[PDB]
């Protein structure tokens, strides 16, 4: 019953040449599942980052 995710999927930078075989180089997406605090740190430049 949750709202389906509508997203823009892009195949940019892809290429078709005489490679070894059809293979995926990389995949990325900006969504994530719920997560709870695990750790925290103070970076070299001063930013406080929670993992």
């Amino acid at each position: 019953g949750a709202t389906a995710a509508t997203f823009s999927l892009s195949f940019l930078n892809s290429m078709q040449q005489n490679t070894g075989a059809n293979n995926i180089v990389a995949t990325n997406q900006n969504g994530y599942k719920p997560g709870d605090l695990v750790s925290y740190q103070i970076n070299n430049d001063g930013t406080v980052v929670g993992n």
């Binding site: 997203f7 995949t27 969504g31």
Partner: protein, 101 residues
């Protein structure tokens, strides 16, 4: 004779490792900015920072470390915002519906 004044010697000291993740030191110039419970603003070079009961970053005496906060989703350092006490919340981080792939 008259005591003209008391001059501090602001030379960098030795940096000794301790292994604590909340422990940080300043090399070269620069001061940590702290805020008292009454709102008075102070500056200190000591780097013994610990997390208090209310999830704020405070030193030994209880003065809150201050800095640029993060706003937005994803949050970003607001360089144009006034410094605010640093807080490390333990609140649940919600999910983001996928937008670009």
């Amino acid at each position: 004779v008259k005591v003209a004044g008391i001059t501090q010697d602001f030379t960098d000291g030795t940096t000794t490792n301790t292994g604590r993740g909340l422990d940080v030191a300043i090399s070269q110039n620069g001061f940590f900015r702290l805020v008292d419970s009454n709102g008075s603003v102070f500056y200190s070079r000591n780097g013994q920072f610990k997390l208090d009961e209310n999830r704020n970053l405070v030193n030994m005496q209880g003065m809150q470390l201050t800095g640029y906060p993060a706003t937005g989703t994803p949050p970003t350092i607001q360089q144009g915002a006034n410094p605010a006490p640093i807080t490390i919340p333990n609140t649940l981080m919600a999910a983001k519906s996928t937008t670009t792939a």
